[PDB]
Amino acid sequence: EGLKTKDEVEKACHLAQQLKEVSITLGVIYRTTERHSVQVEAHKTAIDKHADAVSRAVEALTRVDVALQRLKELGKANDTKAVKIIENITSARENLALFNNETQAVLTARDHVHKHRAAALQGWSDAKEKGDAAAEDVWVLLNAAKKGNGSADVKAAAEKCSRYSSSSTSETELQKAIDAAANVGGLSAHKSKYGDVLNKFKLSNASVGAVRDTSGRGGKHMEKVNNVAKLLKDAEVSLAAAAAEIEEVKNAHETKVQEEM
């Protein structure tokens, strides 16, 4: 089986084009992930800045919990001023837990973006390696079809065939080309090669979809980070006051117990 009819030549031509288009279309699709890498890196910087900016609030909250733990040890954590202080600070405690949780979610999303991007890249590279080589195999038949005992129409079609598709490929178009070529004896020797090219295309493309979805979830977590970071910073002065007050309460109960022993 060489390509002897115009129909066989055209099905081979279209396939060779689509296989060669795999690397070009996938590079285009891959390049859409760079904006997501930039976004996640930007989230990480913003988180590091928020972590600095909230640290005085966090320090005050730690001081409060330290003093409360000591009041609980003394059996005096039911002191009405302690109770009042704990009420006053509970929203900030809750906001700190949310900041920790949403920042973690942002950072996991960041990790996942890079991982999906690395897989998209490797998928692209495998797809190109396979696609370019399978297209070369087809071109053996196409070039042979320019000469010999095929029809004049077969030879002319082979002469006309360009290396390149005029538009982007896709899972559907590549598969369409492969399926059309299933009818053609000489091309059928490479069927498994064609399959593996398509599988790598799918994998790369799916990884790019995962980058985009992951990055969208990341952004929504980051909005919550930004909201709660501001609430913590805003509470910093009242948290420092609360820490001093409960320290005083705790110190009074310490000295009452010392002086009573």
Author numbering: 37 to 297
The article reads:
haptoglobin forms a stable complex with a haemoglobin dimer. Trypanosomes take up this HpHb complex but not the individual components.
Here, we present the structure of T. brucei HpHbR. containing the corresponding region of TbHpHbR (residues 36–299). TbHpHbR using higher-resolution data obtained from crystals of the receptor alone. with a total length of 118 Å. ∼50° kink towards the membrane proximal C-terminal end. the presence of a ∼50° kink in TbHpHbR. approximately one-third of the way along the receptor from the membrane proximal end. Ala89, Glu123, Asn124, Asp270 and Ala271 no longer forming hydrogen bonds. hydrophilic residues around the kink site in each of the three helices.
